[PDB]
PDB file of C-alpha atoms and ligand atoms in Angstrom:
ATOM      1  CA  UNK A   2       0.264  -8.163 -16.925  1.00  0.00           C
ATOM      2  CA  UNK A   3      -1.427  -9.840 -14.043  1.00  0.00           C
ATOM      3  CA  UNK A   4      -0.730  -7.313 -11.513  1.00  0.00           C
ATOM      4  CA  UNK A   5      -2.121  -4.218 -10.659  1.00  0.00           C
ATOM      5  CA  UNK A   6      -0.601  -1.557  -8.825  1.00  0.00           C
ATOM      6  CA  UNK A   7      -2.716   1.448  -7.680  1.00  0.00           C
ATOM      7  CA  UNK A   8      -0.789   4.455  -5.642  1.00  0.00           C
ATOM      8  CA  UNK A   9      -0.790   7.787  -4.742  1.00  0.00           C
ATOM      9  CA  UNK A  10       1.931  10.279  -4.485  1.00  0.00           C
ATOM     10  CA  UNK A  11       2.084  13.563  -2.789  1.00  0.00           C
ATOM     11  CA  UNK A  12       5.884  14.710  -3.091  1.00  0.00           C
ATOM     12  CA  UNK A  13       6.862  11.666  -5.409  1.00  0.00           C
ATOM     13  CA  UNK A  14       8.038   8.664  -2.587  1.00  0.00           C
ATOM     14  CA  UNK A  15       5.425   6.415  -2.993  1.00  0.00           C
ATOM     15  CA  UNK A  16       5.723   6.543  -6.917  1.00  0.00           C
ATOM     16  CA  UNK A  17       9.481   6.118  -6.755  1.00  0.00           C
ATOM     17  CA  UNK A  18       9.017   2.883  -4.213  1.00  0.00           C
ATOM     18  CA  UNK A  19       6.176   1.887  -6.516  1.00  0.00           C
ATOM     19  CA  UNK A  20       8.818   1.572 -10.018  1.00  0.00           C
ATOM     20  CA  UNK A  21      11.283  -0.177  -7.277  1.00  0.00           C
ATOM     21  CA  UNK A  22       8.183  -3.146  -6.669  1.00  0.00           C
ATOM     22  CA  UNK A  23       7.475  -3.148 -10.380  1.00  0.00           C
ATOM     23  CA  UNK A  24      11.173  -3.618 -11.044  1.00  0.00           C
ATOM     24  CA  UNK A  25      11.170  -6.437  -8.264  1.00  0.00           C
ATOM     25  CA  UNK A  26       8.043  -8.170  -9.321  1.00  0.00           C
ATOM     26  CA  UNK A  27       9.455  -8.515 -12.825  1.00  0.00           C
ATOM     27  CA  UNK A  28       8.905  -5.620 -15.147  1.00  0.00           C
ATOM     28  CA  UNK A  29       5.862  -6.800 -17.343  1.00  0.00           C
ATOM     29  CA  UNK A  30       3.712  -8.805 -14.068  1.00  0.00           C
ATOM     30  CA  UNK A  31       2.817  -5.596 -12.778  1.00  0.00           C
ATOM     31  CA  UNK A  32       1.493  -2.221 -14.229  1.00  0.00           C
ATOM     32  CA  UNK A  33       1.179   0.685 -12.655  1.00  0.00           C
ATOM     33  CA  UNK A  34      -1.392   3.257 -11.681  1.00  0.00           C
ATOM     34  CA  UNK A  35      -1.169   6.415  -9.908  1.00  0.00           C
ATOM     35  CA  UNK A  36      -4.886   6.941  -8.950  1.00  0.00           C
ATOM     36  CA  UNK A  37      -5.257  10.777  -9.898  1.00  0.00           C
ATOM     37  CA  UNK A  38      -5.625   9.584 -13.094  1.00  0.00           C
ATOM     38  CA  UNK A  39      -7.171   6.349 -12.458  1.00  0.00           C
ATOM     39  CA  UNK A  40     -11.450   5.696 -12.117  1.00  0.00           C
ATOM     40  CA  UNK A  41     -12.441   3.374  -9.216  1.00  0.00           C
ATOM     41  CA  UNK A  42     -13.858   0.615 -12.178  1.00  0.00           C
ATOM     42  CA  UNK A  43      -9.665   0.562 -13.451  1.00  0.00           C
ATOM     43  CA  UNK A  44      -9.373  -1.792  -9.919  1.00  0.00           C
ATOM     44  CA  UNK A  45     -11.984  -4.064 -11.534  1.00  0.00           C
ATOM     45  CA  UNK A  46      -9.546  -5.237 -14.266  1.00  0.00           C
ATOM     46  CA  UNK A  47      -7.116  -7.304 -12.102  1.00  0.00           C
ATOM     47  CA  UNK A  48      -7.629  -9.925  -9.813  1.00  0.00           C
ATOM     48  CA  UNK A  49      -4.372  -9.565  -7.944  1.00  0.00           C
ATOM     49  CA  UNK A  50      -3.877  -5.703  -6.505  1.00  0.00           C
ATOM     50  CA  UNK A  51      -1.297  -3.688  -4.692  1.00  0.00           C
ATOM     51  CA  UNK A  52      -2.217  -0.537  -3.519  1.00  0.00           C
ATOM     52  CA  UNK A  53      -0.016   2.345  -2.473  1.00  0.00           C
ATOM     53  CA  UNK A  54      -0.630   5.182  -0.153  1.00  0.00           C
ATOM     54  CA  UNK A  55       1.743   7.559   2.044  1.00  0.00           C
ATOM     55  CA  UNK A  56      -0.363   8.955   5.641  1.00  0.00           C
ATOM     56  CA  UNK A  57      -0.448  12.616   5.093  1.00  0.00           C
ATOM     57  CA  UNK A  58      -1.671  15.406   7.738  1.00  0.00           C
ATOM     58  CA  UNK A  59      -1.872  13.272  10.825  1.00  0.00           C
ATOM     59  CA  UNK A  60      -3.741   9.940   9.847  1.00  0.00           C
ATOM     60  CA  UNK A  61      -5.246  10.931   6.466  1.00  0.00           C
ATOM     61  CA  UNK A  62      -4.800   9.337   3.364  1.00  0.00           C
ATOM     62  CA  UNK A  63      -3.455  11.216   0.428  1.00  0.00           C
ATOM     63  CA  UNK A  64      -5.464  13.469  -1.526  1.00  0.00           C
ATOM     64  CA  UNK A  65      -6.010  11.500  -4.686  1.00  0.00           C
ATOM     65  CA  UNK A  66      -6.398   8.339  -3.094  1.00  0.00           C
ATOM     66  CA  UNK A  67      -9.230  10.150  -0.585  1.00  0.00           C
ATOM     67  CA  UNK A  68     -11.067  11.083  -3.915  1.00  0.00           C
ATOM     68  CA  UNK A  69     -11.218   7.716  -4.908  1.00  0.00           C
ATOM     69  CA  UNK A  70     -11.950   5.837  -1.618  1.00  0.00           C
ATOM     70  CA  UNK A  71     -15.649   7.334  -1.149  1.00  0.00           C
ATOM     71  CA  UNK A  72     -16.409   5.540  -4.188  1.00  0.00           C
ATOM     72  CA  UNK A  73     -15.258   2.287  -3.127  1.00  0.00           C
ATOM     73  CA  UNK A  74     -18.543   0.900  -2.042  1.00  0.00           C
ATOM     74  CA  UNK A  75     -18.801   0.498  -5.594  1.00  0.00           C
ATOM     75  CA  UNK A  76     -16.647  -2.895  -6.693  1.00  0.00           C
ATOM     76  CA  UNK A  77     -16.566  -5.484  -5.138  1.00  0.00           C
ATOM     77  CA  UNK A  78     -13.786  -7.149  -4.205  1.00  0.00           C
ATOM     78  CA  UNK A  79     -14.520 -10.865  -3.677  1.00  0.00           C
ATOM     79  CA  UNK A  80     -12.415 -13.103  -5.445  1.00  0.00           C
ATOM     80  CA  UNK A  81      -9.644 -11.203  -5.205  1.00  0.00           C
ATOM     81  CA  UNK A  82      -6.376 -10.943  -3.569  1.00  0.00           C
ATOM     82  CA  UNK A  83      -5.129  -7.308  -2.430  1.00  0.00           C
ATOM     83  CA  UNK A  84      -1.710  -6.325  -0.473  1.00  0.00           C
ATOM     84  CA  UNK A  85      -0.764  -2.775   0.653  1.00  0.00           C
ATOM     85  CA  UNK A  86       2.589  -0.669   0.887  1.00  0.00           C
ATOM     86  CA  UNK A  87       2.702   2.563   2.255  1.00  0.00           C
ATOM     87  CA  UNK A  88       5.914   5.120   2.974  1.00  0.00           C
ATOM     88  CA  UNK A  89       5.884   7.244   6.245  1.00  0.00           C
ATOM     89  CA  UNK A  90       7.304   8.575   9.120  1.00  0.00           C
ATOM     90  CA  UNK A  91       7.573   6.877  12.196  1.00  0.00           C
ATOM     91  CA  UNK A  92       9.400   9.514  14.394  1.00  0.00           C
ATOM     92  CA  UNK A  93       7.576  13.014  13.231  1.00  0.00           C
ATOM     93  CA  UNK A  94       4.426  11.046  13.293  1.00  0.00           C
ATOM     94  CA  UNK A  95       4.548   9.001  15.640  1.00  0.00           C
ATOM     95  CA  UNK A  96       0.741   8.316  16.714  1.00  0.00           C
ATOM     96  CA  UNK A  97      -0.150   8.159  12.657  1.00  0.00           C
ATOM     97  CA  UNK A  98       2.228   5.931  11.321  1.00  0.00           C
ATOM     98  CA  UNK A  99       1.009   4.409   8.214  1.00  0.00           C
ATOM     99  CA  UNK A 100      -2.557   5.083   8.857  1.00  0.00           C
ATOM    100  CA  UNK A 101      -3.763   5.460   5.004  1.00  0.00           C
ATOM    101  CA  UNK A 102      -3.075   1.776   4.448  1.00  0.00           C
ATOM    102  CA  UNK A 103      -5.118   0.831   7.641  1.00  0.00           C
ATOM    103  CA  UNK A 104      -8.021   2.634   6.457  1.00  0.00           C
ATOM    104  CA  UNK A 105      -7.999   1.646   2.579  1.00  0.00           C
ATOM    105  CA  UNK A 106      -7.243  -2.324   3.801  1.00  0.00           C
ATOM    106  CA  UNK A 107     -10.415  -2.167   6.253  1.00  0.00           C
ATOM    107  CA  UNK A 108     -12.650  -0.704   3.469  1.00  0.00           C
ATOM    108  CA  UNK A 109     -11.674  -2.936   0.719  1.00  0.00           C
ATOM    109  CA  UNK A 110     -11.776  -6.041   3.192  1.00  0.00           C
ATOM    110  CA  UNK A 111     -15.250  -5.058   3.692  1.00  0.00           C
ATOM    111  CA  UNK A 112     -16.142  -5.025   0.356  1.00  0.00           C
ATOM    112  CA  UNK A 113     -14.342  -8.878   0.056  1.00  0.00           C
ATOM    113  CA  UNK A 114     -11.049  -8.480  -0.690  1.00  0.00           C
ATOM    114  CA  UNK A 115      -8.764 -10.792   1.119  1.00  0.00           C
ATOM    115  CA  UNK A 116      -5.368  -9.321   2.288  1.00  0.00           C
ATOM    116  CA  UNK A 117      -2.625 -10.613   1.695  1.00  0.00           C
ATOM    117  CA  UNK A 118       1.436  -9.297   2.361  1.00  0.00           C
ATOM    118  CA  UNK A 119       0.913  -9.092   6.795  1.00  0.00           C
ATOM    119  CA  UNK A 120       4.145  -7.520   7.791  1.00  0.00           C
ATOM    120  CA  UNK A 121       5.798  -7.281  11.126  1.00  0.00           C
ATOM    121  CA  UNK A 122       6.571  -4.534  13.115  1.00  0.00           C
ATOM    122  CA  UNK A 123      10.104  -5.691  14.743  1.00  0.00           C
ATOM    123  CA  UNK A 124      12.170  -3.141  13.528  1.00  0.00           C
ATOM    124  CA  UNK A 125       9.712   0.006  14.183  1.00  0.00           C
ATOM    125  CA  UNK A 126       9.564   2.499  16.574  1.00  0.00           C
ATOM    126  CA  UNK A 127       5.736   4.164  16.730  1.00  0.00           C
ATOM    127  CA  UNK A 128       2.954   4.784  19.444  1.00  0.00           C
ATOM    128  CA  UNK A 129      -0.180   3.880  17.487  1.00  0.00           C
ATOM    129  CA  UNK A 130      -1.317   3.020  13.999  1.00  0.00           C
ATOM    130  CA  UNK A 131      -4.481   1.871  12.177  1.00  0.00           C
ATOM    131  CA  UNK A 132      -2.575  -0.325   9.938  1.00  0.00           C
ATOM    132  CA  UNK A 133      -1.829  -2.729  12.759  1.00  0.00           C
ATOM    133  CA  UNK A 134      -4.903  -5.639  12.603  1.00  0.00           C
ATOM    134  CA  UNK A 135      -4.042  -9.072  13.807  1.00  0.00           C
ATOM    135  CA  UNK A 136      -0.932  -8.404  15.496  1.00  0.00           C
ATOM    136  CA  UNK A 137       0.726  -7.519  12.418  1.00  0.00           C
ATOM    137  CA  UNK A 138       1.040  -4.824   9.751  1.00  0.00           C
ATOM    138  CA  UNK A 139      -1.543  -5.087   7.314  1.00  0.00           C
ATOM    139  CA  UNK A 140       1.258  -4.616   4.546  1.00  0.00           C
ATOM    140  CA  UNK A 141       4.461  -3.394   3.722  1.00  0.00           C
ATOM    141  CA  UNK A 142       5.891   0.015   6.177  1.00  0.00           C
ATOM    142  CA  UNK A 143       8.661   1.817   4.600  1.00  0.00           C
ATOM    143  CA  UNK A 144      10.148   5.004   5.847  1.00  0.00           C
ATOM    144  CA  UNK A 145      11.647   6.675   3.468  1.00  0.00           C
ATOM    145  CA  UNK A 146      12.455   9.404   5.632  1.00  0.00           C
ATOM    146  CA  UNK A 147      14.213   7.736   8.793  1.00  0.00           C
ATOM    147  CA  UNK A 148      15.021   4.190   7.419  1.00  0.00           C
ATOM    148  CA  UNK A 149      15.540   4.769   4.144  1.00  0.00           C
ATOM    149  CA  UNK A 150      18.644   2.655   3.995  1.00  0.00           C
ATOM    150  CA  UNK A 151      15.888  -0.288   4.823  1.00  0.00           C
ATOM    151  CA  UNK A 152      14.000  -0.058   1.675  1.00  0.00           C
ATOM    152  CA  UNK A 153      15.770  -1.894  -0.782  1.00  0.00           C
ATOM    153  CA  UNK A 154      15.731  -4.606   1.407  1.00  0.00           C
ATOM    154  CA  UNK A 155      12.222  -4.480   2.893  1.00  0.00           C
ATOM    155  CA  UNK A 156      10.488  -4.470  -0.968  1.00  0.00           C
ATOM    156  CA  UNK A 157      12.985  -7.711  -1.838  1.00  0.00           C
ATOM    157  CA  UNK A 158      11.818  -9.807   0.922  1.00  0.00           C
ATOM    158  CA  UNK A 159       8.131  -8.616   0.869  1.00  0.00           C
ATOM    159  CA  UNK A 160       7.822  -9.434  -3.177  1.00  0.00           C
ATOM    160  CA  UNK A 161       9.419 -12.962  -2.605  1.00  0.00           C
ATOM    161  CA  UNK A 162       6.782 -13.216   0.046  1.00  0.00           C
ATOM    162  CA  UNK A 163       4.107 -12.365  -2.200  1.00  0.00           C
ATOM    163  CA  UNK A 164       5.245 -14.123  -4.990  1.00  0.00           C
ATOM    164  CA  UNK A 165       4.293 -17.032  -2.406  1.00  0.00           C
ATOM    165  CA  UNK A 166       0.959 -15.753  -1.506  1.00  0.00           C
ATOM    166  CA  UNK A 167       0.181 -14.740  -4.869  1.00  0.00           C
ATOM    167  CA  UNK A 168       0.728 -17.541  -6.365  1.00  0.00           C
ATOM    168  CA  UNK A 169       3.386 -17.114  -9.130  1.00  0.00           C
TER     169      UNK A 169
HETATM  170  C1  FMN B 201       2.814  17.767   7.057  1.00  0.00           C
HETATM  171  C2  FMN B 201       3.105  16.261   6.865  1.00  0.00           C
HETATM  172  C3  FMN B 201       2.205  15.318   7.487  1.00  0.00           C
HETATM  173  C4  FMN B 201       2.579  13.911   7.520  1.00  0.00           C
HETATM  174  N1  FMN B 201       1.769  12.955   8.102  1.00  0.00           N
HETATM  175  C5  FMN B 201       1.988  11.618   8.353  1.00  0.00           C
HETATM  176  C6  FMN B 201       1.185  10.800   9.199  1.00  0.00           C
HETATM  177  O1  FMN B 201       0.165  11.147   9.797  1.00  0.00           O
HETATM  178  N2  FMN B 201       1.717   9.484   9.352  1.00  0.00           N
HETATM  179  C7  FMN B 201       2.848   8.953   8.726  1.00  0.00           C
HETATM  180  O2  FMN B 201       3.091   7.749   8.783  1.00  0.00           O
HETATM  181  N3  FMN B 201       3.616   9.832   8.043  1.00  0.00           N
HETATM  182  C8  FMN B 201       3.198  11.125   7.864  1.00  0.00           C
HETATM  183  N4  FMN B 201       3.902  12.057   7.055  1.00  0.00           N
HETATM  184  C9  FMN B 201       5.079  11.473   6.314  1.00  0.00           C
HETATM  185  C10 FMN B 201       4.800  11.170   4.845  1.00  0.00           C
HETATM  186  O3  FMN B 201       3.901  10.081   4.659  1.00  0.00           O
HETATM  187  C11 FMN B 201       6.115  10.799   4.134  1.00  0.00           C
HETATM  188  O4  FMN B 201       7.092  11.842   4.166  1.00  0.00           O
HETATM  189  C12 FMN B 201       5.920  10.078   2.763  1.00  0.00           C
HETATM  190  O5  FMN B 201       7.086   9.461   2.236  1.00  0.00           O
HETATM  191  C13 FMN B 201       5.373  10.969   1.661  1.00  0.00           C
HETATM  192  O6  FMN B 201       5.158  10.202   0.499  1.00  0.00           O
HETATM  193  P1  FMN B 201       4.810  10.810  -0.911  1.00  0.00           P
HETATM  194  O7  FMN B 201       5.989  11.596  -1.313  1.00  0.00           O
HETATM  195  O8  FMN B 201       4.578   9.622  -1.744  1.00  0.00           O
HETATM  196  O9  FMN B 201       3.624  11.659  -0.647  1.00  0.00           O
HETATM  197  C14 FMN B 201       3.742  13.436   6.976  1.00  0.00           C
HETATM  198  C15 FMN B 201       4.477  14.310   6.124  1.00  0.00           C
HETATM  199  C16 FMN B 201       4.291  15.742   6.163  1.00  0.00           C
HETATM  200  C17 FMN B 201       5.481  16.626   5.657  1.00  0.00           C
END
């Protein structure tokens, strides 16, 4: 209903954390989107957005979500709130961790969307990332791969949070 959830998936993760937010949130606030399906004017449509997005190949986002993000110039944003989850992995990729959100959170600021869902990073071991602004994570960091015993946990307190700064 009011929620929309946009997120790629490489090897499934992200889609499987996605259902886990959904199921979370409620079941009928948010509906999801996986983006190789989805046109850039879908994001238009809600005025509360999560978007999801593993780092694949060193710092890049994934490849649907890279198709999509050249043509983000193209809605604006302003008046709406947007927060960001991505999955990763802090110890193979170390320098890179969580990068994709970084970059999608910087461009869609830009174009006026105000962030919402800062997460710490107590808790995480990693050299360098480009989803660190403000002395915080930029959204949610799962690892799926190293701390997957975390993630349960992690999406429960980060969609009470958001209910908050959301508004519901
Ligand atoms: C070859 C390869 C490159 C990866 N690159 C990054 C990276 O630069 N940073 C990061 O945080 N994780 C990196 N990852 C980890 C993935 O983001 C992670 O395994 C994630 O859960 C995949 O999600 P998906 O199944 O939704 O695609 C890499 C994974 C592989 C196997």
């Amino acid at each position: 209903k009011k929620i929309g959830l946009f997120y790629g998936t490489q090897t499934g993760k992200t889609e499987s954390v996605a259902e886990i937010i959904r199921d979370e949130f409620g079941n009928d606030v948010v509906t999801l989107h996986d983006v190789s399906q989805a046109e850039v004017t879908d994001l238009n449509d809600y005025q509360y957005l999560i978007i999801g997005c593993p780092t694949w190949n060193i710092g890049e986002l994934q490849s649907d979500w890279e198709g999509l993000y050249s043509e983000l110039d193209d809605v604006d944003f302003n008046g709406k709130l947007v927060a960001y989850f991505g999955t990763g992995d802090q110890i193979g990729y170390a320098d890179n961790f969580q990068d994709a959100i970084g970059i999608l959170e910087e461009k869609i600021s830009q174009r006026g969307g105000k962030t919402v869902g800062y997460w710490s990073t107590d808790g995480y071991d990693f050299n360098d990332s480009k989803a660190l602004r403000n002395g915080k994570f930029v959204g949610l960091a799962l690892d799926e791969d190293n701390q997957s015993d975390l993630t349960d946990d992690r999406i429960k307190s980060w969609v009470a949070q958001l209910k908050s700064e959301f508004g519901l």
